[PDB]
Amino acid sequence: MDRAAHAVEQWRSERPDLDPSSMIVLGRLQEAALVIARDRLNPLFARYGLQPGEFDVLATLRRSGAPYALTPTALYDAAMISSGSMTNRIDRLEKAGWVERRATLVALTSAGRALIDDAVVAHVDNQRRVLSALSAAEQRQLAKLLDKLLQGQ
- Which residues bind to a copy of itself, rule: CB under 8 A? 2-4, 6-7, 10-11, 13-15, 18-37, 39-41, 59-60, 62-65, 78-83, 117, 120-121, 124, 127-128, 130-134, 138-139, 141-143, 145-153
- Distance of closest approach, residue 107 Cβ to a copy of itself, in angstroms: 15
CA distances in angstroms from 11 to 3, 20, 27, listed in the order given: 12, 7, 13
- Distance of closest approach, residue 5 Cβ to a copy of itself, in angstroms: 8
Q: Which is nearer to a copy of itself, 39 or 91 (CB)?
A: 39
Around 76, how many Cα atoms within 13 Å sit in the side-chain half-sphere?
A: 9
Q: Which is nearer to a copy of itself, 16 or 95 (CB)?
A: 16
Q: Which is nearer to a copy of itself, 103 or 153 (CB)?
A: 153
- Distance of closest approach, residue 95 Cβ to a copy of itself, in angstroms: 26
Contacts of 70 (CB under 8 A, 6+ apart): 60, 61, 64, 78, 105, 106, 107
